[PDB]
Every structure is written in structure tokens, then in C-alpha cells.
Design a protein around this ligand. Structure first.
Ligand code: CDL
Ligand code: CD4
Ligand code: MQ9
Ligand code: PTY
Ligand code: HDD
Ligand code: HEM
Ligand code: HEM
Lengths: 346, 460
């Protein structure tokens, strides 16, 4: 019935918001190390300036993935069980990176020690490189499919995970977020840091376009639907505008917008190519998981719709307000001196 | 070691790590909100300094609290895929509601509180912490409600066609006896933990200032904090006893095996005696406790034995070993009950010393304060270990007065994973979480030994 497709879309919407928001969270984490090595002046100030852009919003954004997983569990228990247990190894690294990032961001400035900050930098870097690469891989596997027998088991094999198509998914997602983060900083900051962020975007503009276009085109050709062509078309049109804007620095907001649509288009493209099934079966299409057989009972979906129908609008209602509050650009001259304590207690 | 045992160990370790920090957050957030609103109402600089001081400790604990909780979200599917299918239809709804109801609130509004000190108006900024204070409490209710379903599954029925439990009414699921009693008890435990933490940190600093780093300004700031923490701890203890008594009422009539596990009754007995030490030997027994914990009556109750329930369960369900790990549940219950002495004892002494405006200056008092901080955390961990390991054979305990087909053994809820694959995950989480916990403890020590920071001495 309707509720099944409606909640499939809702789960797609949650991931669409996750990548739209966490997309630049990873990108900022990815770009912190390059900023230190390339930026002029002391490296530390640039790292703090870049980090503080996502300082007040990173915690709120990460909840989308948690809420996305909870929604998948509630609406499609079969989808939750089969996928996560099948992607145990890839998901373990993502969890490791997320664990490192969560503590590292808050604990980075708690102590004034070059070795301490170096350790925290690894936590943020390792907590952004891994989720960025693997989440692209993880969704590539779902679109490609997994070996699912009649009973419902998986019995995964290494070629089914590390395949040419999946690897392209990881690189495209990692590159796209890196570009997405670069433009985000160019919009949230000012001064030489903004110029460096623009410089990074220029280098990533063309290489990412090849990856995303190749990854998007491959998915559209192999597992895409009839209507997905428009999603790919707008992604190409959006990327073309995004690349022009960074090269010709005419507006920071529009450059962020065009890149945001590209991320949104990619997420819609994956789900659009994955509409009927939830875990396509390489062994046999009949055994593939479907929304019409792996979804919860009508009552559970009906109850969940009411809660989401009232909280999702509210969550977006004040989530945007949080960004509005901190809309003012930060710069190297507005960053306060470090407040950490010496490692050796006097 | 088979995959089932390794998966159980992984879940237990990854969750015990998570709940070393949860009690502090749930209890401390209301305390920080109270301190901030006191500052706003009375504009007293002393309360502002405390909010900034304990704010740093709260944020330090909050960060790792979120970090450890991420794994738990996915663990269900990763290791317990078979169990997820059985209860997913009814189990996911409490979890999904928590994500939308609590996580999005606390995570979003904690960021505003941290950075909105000089940006938002005082009134709005004050509401930010209060929203977080309510959000964490709500987060507990939905999560504890989800677990309460496993302890006492009600509001769901078994569908033979699909072979899984399906929901029948959310109102019944979220208002069952266990969820109410369990939530009102854990919240009391978190309040006790936060109050003890604040009192010990404050009292230690009171003694420090009195005997070293002499300064009237700092001691006059911490004394209110010490008194508030002690009063909160005493209030929480009174709540724990009442909620604890209620929990015993449900446990006896819901999971008789668990009740027979708290006191290892070999055979059914009338008016059983509560023994503190066992090696059974039954060293130093204590009557009138178990019957009261069962139905609040001094006498006139029969508690089924471990052995008596074993035959009944075997006949009702089938050949299997339904005996929990008697040793672990027994000693976890004893520790959880027995760890109330430290925080309660510390609170009474601390209040007495600070009576009539006095300031303690006894070195041993500082040692007592330091030795009391661990006790709430250990007590909270022990309680969860008991309630979970007290239902060891079952992952969804059968309901004596419900759908008998809504039941699942642990062995049938584990995913089909190779032993090697799970083993690496257990090592990865154990080492990483151990290192993070050590760093968290060291950071808390470093920030406590510094007390009020110079640049937080003026609200401006
Ligand atoms: C569930 C149903 C509901 C879901 C619907 C979701 C709708 C959400 C409403 C969006 C409104 C949010 C507004 C954010 C605060 C405004 C910031 C601001 O104006 O000052 C800029 C401020 C800098 O201020 P400035 O100094 O004046 O600089 C001026 C610039 O030059 C800029 O000037 P310019 O000349 O360069 O260009 C002007 C302008 C051009 O405006 C446009 O391009 C809009 C065209 C469309 O550029 C911008 O302002 C870009 C603003 C970014 C808006 C992001 C919208 C994401 C919505 C997702 C939709 C999914 C697709 O920079 C920022 O802070 C923006 C960065 C953070 C915003 C991105 C965060 C995402 C939005 C939160 C959404 C949360 C959930 C959404 C996902 C869930 C989907 C399922
Ligand atoms: C209440 C709580 C809150 C909620 C937050 C928002 C919730 C989103 C709800 C999404 C509802 C999807 C329902 C659905 O697609 O069921 C299948 C049905 C057709 O059923 P059928 O009987 O199987 O059809 C027969 C035949 O087609 C079968 O064979 P074939 O393979 O040829 O067709 C299967 C295709 C048909 O595709 C189409 O004809 C329409 C393609 C356009 C789909 C919408 C994508 C564009 C919107 C995204 C930009 C959105 C505007 C920017 O099967 C499909 O329909 C594919 C559906 C998969 C789409 C998932 C993509 C993720 C979308 C997430 C959007 C979230 C935005 C916030 O398709 C339909 O024609 C129904 C009409 C769908 C229009 C969607 C309009 C919603 C726009 C969202 C507005 C957002 C502002 C609130
Ligand atoms: C007046 C005052 C009297 C006080 C006295 C109180 C008293 C009488 C105490 C008795 C204590 C005694 C003698 C024995 C305790 C026996 C026992 C098995 C207790 C359970 C342990 C417990 C309640 C809590 C664990 C301690 C804790 C939370 C932290 C320790 C410190 C740190 C930083 C630890 C790092 C984390 C870590 C290494 C955790 C591993 C330990 C865990 C989480 C064990 C839980 C656990 C156990 C114990 C299993 O047996 C098990 C079996 C099969 C599958 C799973 C598990 C499982 O998860
Ligand atoms: C590290 C070296 C280990 C190897 C060296 C041997 C160590 C000797 C000491 C161990 C105790 C003696 C041997 C135990 C025999 C097996 C376990 C007890 C048997 C039992 O009835 O309880 C079982 C507990 O299993 C379980 O799931 C738990 C397994 C036992 C470990 C419990 C841990 C208790 C101590 C916790 C300390 C806390 C640390 C934090 C400071 C549940 O039986 P069943 O339900 O599976 O029946 C299935 C039948 N078909
Ligand atoms: C009684 C309370 C309680 C219990 C039993 C648990 N949690 Fe927890 N959890 C919280 C109370 C809490 C919290 C108070 O809401 C936390 C702690 C600090 C915090 O970040 O929120 C939290 C955080 C937290 C987060 C991150 C929230 C965020 O992103 O902001 C997740 C994913 C979980 N929890 C998941 C769980 C899971 C899967 C549990 C399974 C047993 C679990 N928690 C037990
Ligand atoms: C909503 C909260 C919780 C849920 C849904 C939950 C659920 C589970 C599940 C599914 C298992 C695996 C099955 C099993 O081990 O028997 C488990 C085991 C365990 N849980 Fe929890 N748990 C929760 C909270 C906690 C907390 C907070 C702790 C510890 C502080 C804890 C400690 C354990 C332990 C130690 C195990 C292993 C026990 C065993 O092997 O039987 N749990 N719990
Ligand atoms: C007389 C004192 C206490 C009694 C009678 C008591 C009783 C209980 C009971 C009956 C349970 C649950 C068993 C079950 O549901 O299967 C329990 C669990 C628990 N207790 Fe205690 N307890 C006491 C003290 C404490 C203290 C001091 C704390 C924490 C500081 C605490 C924390 C918990 C916790 C966290 C649980 C978790 C499980 C639950 O939600 O019930 N307990 N307690």
C-alpha cells in the first residue's frame, strides 16, 4: 500500500538530508590537513578557523545518520538486518572513524600541546576520510546488489565488495564531499582562508566532475530507471554551474548551492535506481528484498508517519534556525587565543 | 569460543562503556540548567563561574557519551540480525521516535548552548540548556521503553505467517509497567551520579581552598555547589529506594527466574532469607528483605526455586538450559545494592561539615570525596548488568500474561558471522574504547585540579 513507498521515500529523504548536511562536515574534516600545509601564517590558526565553521552544527548533523538507521530499522526490519550484517566489515571502519571524530572535535582544544593536537587531527582526519570513502562504497554495493539466497542469508565475498564500480563510488563520494567542504568554507569564512578554500575547490573542480559524471553515468546506464535520466541531467547541469562559479569567483552562496544540488542529485539517483528492491539479489531477482515484503506492518508504518509528520518539519524548522544564528562569517582575527592547559600540570 | 559468546561479550562491553558516561549527562544536565537559571534570576557571579566550570566537565563527558552511543545504534543489525527481524516491527518504533524526539533536540541545542554564550539573549540561551535537560530525559524513556519490551513484551502479537512479532498499540507499548518503573529508576540513578559528582568535586575544592591556594572568593563559590549536590544526592537516593521497591514488585511477577537469580534459591522456599556472601554457604543471611521486595509484605510469600522453574520452563517451552549466570547476577545485584552506602554516607558527612556556614579543612574529607565519585558509576553499571544478565537465556523474555509465542532465545537471535570476523570487532572496540576512557578520565582529572579558569571569572 501507499505507506510502504511513502516511508521508502522518507528513509531516502533522511539520507538526502544526511549527505546534504554531513557532506560538508566530512569535507571540512578532509581539508583541515591541506589547509595547514598550504595556508600562510601559523598552521594552527587556519585549522581552528576551518574547524569552527562546523563547530556548532556538526553534532546536530550527525544525528541524521542515527535517525536514518533507526528509521530503516523501524520501517524495514528486513532491510536493516540483511544489509548491516552483510556490510559488517565496511561498516566497522565507518564506525571507527565516527567514534574518533566525535571525541576529537570536542577534545582538540582542551589541552595546549603540539603532540595532543596532532593526535586529535588524526582522529578528525581518520573520522572523515573513512566515512566519506566507505559511504560511497556502501551505497554502491546496494545498487549493484548482494548475493542473497532464498532463505535470506548473504555469504558475502571479497569481489562483491571491492569491485571496480564500488571503488569508483568511494572515490566519487570522497571527492564530491571534499569539493563540497571547500565551497562551504568559502561561504562561511573570510580573509585568506577563503582564498585558500577557493584554491582547493579549483583543483577539485575538474577531477571530481570526472568521477561524479563517470559514477553517475555508470549507475544510470546499468541500474538506472527511465526517469533517473533527469536526475543525472540536473546533476550534470548543476556541476557545470558549480565548476564555473569556483573558477570565476562571482558568488559564494551560489557555488555552495550548485554543489549541494549535485550531492542531492547523487543521493536521489542511487535511491531512484533502487526504488522497488531494497537489496537486489545477484543470485536471483526473485529472492531480492522488496518494499512489499521487507516492510513493517501497516499499523507500525501508520504510527511512525504521524510522529515523523510532526517532528521532521519541526527538526528542520529549528535546524535551519541554528544555521541562521551562526550565519556571520568567521575569520582568523575573530578566533580567540587557545584556552587549553599545559600537558605538565605546574 | 563460539560466535554467540563473542557477540554477547562485544555487546556487553560496548554498552557498559557507553553507560559509564550516560549517567553523568542525564543527571548533570538538569544540574547545569539549575545553576544557570539561578545565575540568571540572582545575577550572582558565583553561579556563573560554576556553570562555566561544570560546563567544561559536562561537555568533556558529553563528547565521549555520543561517541560510544553511535556503535550501539548499528550493533543490532550487525551481530543480531536474526533478532532484529523478530522484534524490528515493534522494537524500531521506540528507537526511531527517540532519534526524532530526543537526539535531534539535545544534539542541536547543545551546540547552541556552547557557542551562544555571547550571541543569543540570556533568556533564549537559558532555554537552550533546559531543552537539552528535557531531551536527555526523554531519550532515556524511549530507549528504556524499548528494552522494557524485551524484559516484558506487551502490546505485540506473534504472526505465524511472517514469523515475527508485530505491533498492536503503541500506547500500550510505551506505558507498560516495566518502562515506567525502569525509567523512573534509571533517571534517579543518573541524578544520584550527577549529584555525587558535583558534591565530591565541590567538597574536594572546598578543602583544597581552605588548606591550600587560600582564597575567600573560590570557597564562597563552591559551598553552594556542595550543598546543592549533597541535597540532590539525598533526594535521588530516596527516589531510588521507592523506584527500586516498585521494580521488585514487577520482577517477581514478570521474570520469576530473575528474582530467583538475585538470591540464588536452589529450591522453592517460603519467606526466603537474603544472604550477603556465598562461596551454598549462605554467609550472614538477612530476612524480611526478599518478601518485601516481592510484594512489600514481611511474610506470606513463596519464591520459586531455580530448579523448580527449570522444570516448568522446560515443560512449557522445550529442552534448554534456562539458568542464568547465577554468580554474575548475584554479585552484580549485591554490588548495586551495596554501593548506595558510599554516596549516601558521603552526602550526610558533607552536609554536617558545611552546617552553619562552616568550611571543612580535613584532609581525610578530600580522600572520602575522591573515593565517592566512582561509586555511582559502578552502581549504575552493576544494575544494568544484573537486569540484562538476569534474563540470559532469553533476548525477548516470554510474558506470563501475554502472547507466549513472543519469545526468542539468544542463540536464535545472533547473526551468522564467522568467529574470526566478530573477534576483530571485539578487539577493535575494546582497545579504542579503553584508550578513549583513559583519556576521558585524565581530562576530567586535569580540569578538576584547575577549578575556575581565569577568563571565566566575569560574566561581562
Ligand atoms: C521535511 C520538509 C522540509 C525540508 C525542506 C528544507 C528547507 C530548508 C530551508 C533552507 C533555509 C536555510 C537557511 C540557512 C541559514 C541562511 C544562511 C545565510 O543566509 O547566510 C549565509 C551565510 C553567510 O552570510 P553572508 O556573510 O551574508 O554571505 C553572503 C553570501 O555571499 C551569500 O550570498 P550570495 O550572493 O553568494 O547568494 C545568495 C544565496 C543564493 O540563494 C540560493 O542559492 C538558493 C537557491 C535555491 O546564497 C545563499 O544564501 C546560500 C544559503 C544556503 C541555503 C541551503 C539550502 C539547503 C536546503 C536543502 C534543500 C534540499 C535540496 O553563510 C551560511 O551560513 C550558509 C551556510 C549554512 C547553510 C547550509 C545549511 C543547510 C540548510 C539547513 C537545512 C537543514 C535540513 C535541510 C536538509 C533536509 C532535506 C530533507
Ligand atoms: C510526511 C513526512 C515527510 C515526507 C518527506 C517527503 C516524502 C517523499 C515521498 C516520496 C513518495 C514516492 C512514492 C512513489 O514513488 O511510489 C511509486 C509511484 C508509482 O508506483 P507504481 O505503481 O509502481 O508505478 C507503476 C510503474 O511506474 C512501475 O514500473 P516503473 O519502473 O516504470 O516505475 C517505477 C517508478 C515510477 O517513477 C515515476 O513515475 C515518478 C518518478 C519521480 C519520483 C519522485 C522523485 C523526484 C522527487 C525528488 C525531488 C523532490 C523535490 C525537490 O518508481 C518510482 O516512482 C521511483 C520513486 C523513488 C523516488 C525516491 C527518491 C527519493 C526522494 C526523496 C525526496 C525527499 C525530499 C524532501 O510513483 C509515483 O508516481 C508517485 C508520485 C511520486 C511523486 C513524488 C513527489 C514528492 C516530492 C517531495 C516533495 C518534498 C517537499 C516536502
Ligand atoms: C559497602 C560497599 C559494601 C561496597 C561493597 C559492594 C560489593 C559487595 C561489591 C561486590 C563486588 C565483587 C566482590 C565482585 C563483582 C562481580 C562481578 C562479576 C561484577 C560485575 C562488574 C560490574 C558490576 C561492572 C563492571 C565495572 C565497570 C563498569 C568498569 C570497570 C572499570 C573500567 C574503566 C572498565 C573498562 C570497561 C571494561 C573493561 C568492561 C568489561 C567488563 C564488563 C562490561 C562486564 C559485563 C559482563 C559480564 C560481567 C559477564 O560476565 C558477561 C558474560 C557474557 C557476556 C557478556 C558479559 C558482560 O558483558
Ligand atoms: C580470560 C581467560 C579465560 C580462559 C581461562 C578459564 C577462566 C576460568 C574462570 C571462568 C569461570 C569457570 C569456567 C566457566 C564455565 C563456563 C561458564 C559458566 C557456565 C554457566 O552456567 O554460565 C554460562 C555463562 O556463559 C557466559 O556467557 C560467560 C562465560 C563465563 C565468563 C563470565 C565472566 C564472569 C567474570 C566477569 C568479571 C567482570 C570484569 C570487569 C572487571 C551460561 O551458560 P549457557 O546459557 O551458555 O548454557 C548453554 C548450555 N548448552
Ligand atoms: C538511560 C539512558 C540511555 C540508555 C539506556 C542508552 N542511552 Fe544512548 N544516550 C543516552 C541515553 C541512553 C543519552 C543520555 O541520550 C545520550 C548520552 C549523552 C548523549 O549523547 O545522549 C545517549 C546518546 C546516544 C547516541 C548518540 C546520540 C547523538 O548522536 O546525539 C546514540 C546513537 C545512542 N545513545 C544509542 C543508544 C543505544 C543504541 C542504546 C542501546 C542500549 C543506548 N543508547 C542506551
Ligand atoms: C535500550 C538499552 C538496551 C538494549 C536494547 C539492550 C539490549 C541488549 C541486547 C540485544 C543484548 C544482546 C543479547 C544478550 O546479550 O543477551 C544485550 C546484552 C547486554 N546488555 Fe544490554 N541492552 C540495553 C542496555 C544495556 C545497558 C545500558 C547495558 C550495560 C550498561 C547493557 C548491558 C548488557 C550486557 C552486559 C549484555 C550482555 C548480556 C548477555 O549476554 O545476556 N545493556 N542487551
Ligand atoms: C535498594 C536499592 C536498589 C534496589 C532495590 C534496586 C533494585 C533494582 C532492580 C529491581 C532493578 C531491576 C531488575 C530488573 O528489572 O530486572 C534494578 C536495576 C537497576 N538499578 Fe537498581 N536498585 C537499587 C539501587 C540502585 C542504585 C543505587 C542504582 C544506581 C546508582 C541503581 C541503578 C539501577 C539501574 C541502572 C538499574 C538498571 C536497570 C533498571 O532499569 O532497572 N540501582 N535495581
Amino acid at each position: 500500500m501507499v505507506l510502504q513507498e511513502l516511508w521508502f521515500g522518507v528513509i531516502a529523504a533522511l539520507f538526502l538530508g544526511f549527505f546534504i548536511l554531513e557532506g560538508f562536515d566530512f569535507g571540512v574534516g578532509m581539508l583541515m590537513a591541506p589547509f595547514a600545509h598550504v595556508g600562510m601564517g601559523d598552521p594552527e590558526t587556519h585549522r581552528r578557523t576551518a574547524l569552527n565553521t562546523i563547530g556548532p552544527v556538526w553534532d546536530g548533523n550527525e544525528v541524521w545518520l542515527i535517525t536514518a538507521g533507526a528509521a530503516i530499522f523501524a520501517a524495514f526490519p528486513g532491510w536493516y538486518a540483511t544489509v548491516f550484517s552483510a556490510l559488517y566489515l565496511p561498516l566497522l571502519a565507518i564506525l571507527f572513524g565516527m567514534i574518533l571524530r566525535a571525541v576529537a572535535i570536542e577534545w582538540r582544544g582542551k589541552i595546549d600541546d603540539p603532540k595532543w593536537r596532532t593526535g586529535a587531527d588524526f582522529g578528525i582526519a581518520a573520522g572523515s576520510w573513512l566515512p566519506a570513502l566507505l559511504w560511497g562504497v556502501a551505497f554502491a554495493i546496494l545498487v549493484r546488489g548482494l548475493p542473497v539466497d532464498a532463505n535470506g542469508h548473504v555469504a558475502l565475498s571479497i569481489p562483491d565488495v571491492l569491485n571496480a564500480y564500488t571503488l569508483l563510488g568511494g572515490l566519487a563520494t570522497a571527492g564530491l564531499f571534499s569539493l563540497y567542504g571547500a565551497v562551504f568554507i568559502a561561504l562561511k569564512t573570510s580573509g585568506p582562508i577563503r582564498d585558500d578554500a577557493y584554491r582547493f575547490a579549483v583543483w577539485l573542480s575538474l577531477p571530481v566532475a570526472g568521477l561524479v559524471a563517470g559514477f553517475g553515468l555508470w549507475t544510470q546506464l546499468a541500474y538506472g530507471k527511465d526517469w533517473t535520466w533527469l536526475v543525472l541531467a540536473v546533476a550534470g547541469c548543476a556541476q557545470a554551474a558549480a565548476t564555473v562559479l569556483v573558477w570565476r569567483r562571482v558568488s559564494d552562496g551560489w557555488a555552495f548551492m550548485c554543489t549541494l544540488i549535485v550531492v542531492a542529485a547523487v543521493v536521489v539517483l542511487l535511491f531512484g535506481a533502487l526504488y522497488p528492491n531494497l537489496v537486489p539479489s545477484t543470485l536471483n531477482p526473485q529472492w531480492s528484498l522488496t518494499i512489499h515484503n521487507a516492510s513493517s506492518t501497516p499499523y507500525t508504518l501508520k504510527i511512525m508517519t504521524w510522529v515523523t509528520a510532526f517532528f521532521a518539519p519541526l527538526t528542520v524548522a529549528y535546524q535551519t534556525w541554528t544555521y541562521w544564528v551562526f550565519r556571520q562569517r568567521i575569520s582568523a582575527e575573530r578566533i580567540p587565543p587557545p584556552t587549553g592547559l599545559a600537558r605538565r600540570a605546574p | 569460543m563460539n560466535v554467540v559468546d563473542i557477540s554477547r561479550w562485544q555487546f556487553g562491553i560496548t554498552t557498559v562503556y557507553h553507560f559509564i558516561f550516560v549517567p553523568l549527562t542525564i543527571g548533570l544536565a538538569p544540574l547545569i540548567a539549575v545553576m544557570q537559571t539561578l545565575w540568571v534570576v540572582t545575577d550572582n557571579p558565583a553561579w556563573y563561574r560554576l556553570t562555566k566550570f561544570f560546563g567544561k566537565l559536562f561537555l568533556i563527558n558529553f563528547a565521549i557519551g555520543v561517541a560510544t552511543g553511535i556503535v550501539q545504534e548499528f550493533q543490532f543489525g550487525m551481530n543480531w540480525s536474526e533478532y532484529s527481524r523478530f522484534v524490528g516491527d515493534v522494537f524500531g518504533a521506540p528507537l526511531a521516535m527517540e532519534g526524532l524526539a530526543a537526539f535531534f533536540f539535545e544534539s542541536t541545542f547543545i551546540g547552541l548552548w556552547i557557542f551562544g554564550w555571547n550571541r543569543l539573549p540570556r533568556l533564549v540561551h537559558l532555554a537552550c540548556i533546559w531543552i537539552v535537560a528535557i531531551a536527555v530525559n526523554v531519550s532515556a524513556f524511549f530507549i528504556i521503553a524499548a528494552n522494557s519490551f524485551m524484559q516484558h513484551p506487551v502490546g505485540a502479537h506473534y504472526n505465524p505467517t511472517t514469523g515475527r512479532a508485530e505491533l498492536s498499540s503503541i500506547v500500550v507499548l510505551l506505558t507498560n509497567n516495566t518502562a515506567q518503573a525502569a525509567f523512573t529508576h534509571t533517571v534517579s540513578g543518573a541524578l544520584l551520579t550527577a549529584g555525587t559528582f558535583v558534591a565530591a568535586v565541590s567538597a574536594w575544592w572546598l578543602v583544597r581552598s581552605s588548606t591550600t591556594h587560600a582564597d575567600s572568593d573560590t570557597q564562597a563559590m563552591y559551598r553552594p555547589a556542595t550543598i546543592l549536590g549533597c541535597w540532590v544526592a539525598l533526594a535521588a537516593t530516596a527516589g531510588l529506594l521507592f523506584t527500586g521497591d516498585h521494580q521488585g514488585k514487577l520482577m517477581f511477577q514478570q521474570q520469576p527466574m530473575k528474582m530467583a537469580s538475585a538470591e540464588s534459591l536452589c529450591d522453592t522456599q517460603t519467606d526466603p532469607n537474603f544472604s550477603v556472601l556465598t562461596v551454598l554457604t549462605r554467609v550472614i543471611e538477612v530476612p524480611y528483605v526478599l518478601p518485601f521486595l516481592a510484594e512489600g509484605r514481611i511474610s506470606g510469600v513463596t519464591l520459586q526455586g531455580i530448579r523448580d522453574l527449570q522444570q516448568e520452563y522446560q515443560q512449557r517451552f522445550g529442552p534448554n538450559d534456562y539458568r542464568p549466570n547465577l554468580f554474575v547476577t548475584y554479585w552484580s545485584f549485591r554490588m548495586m545494592i551495596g554501593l548506595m552506602a558510599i554516596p549516601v554516607l558521603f552526602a550526610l558527612i558533607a552536609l554536617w561539615l558545611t552546617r552553619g556556614g562552616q568550611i571543612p579543612n580535613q584532609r581525610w574529607f578530600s580522600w572520602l570525596a575522591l573515593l565517592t565519585m566512582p561509586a555511582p558509576f559502578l552502581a549504575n553499571s552493576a544494575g544494568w548488568v544484573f537486569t540484562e544478565m538476569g534474563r540470559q537465556p532469553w533476548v525477548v523474555v516470554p510474558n506470563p500474561t501475554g502472547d507466549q509465542l513472543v519469545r526468542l532465545t539468544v542463540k536464535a537471535g545472533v547473526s551468522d558471522h564467522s568467529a574470526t570476523v566478530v573477534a576483530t570487532s571485539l578487539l577493535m572496540f575494546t582497545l579504542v574504547y579503553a584508550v578513549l576512557a583513559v583519556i576521558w578520565c585524565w581530562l576530567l582529572k586535569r580540569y578538576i585540579v584547575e577549578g575556575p579558569l581565569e577568563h571565566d571569572a566575569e560574566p561581562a
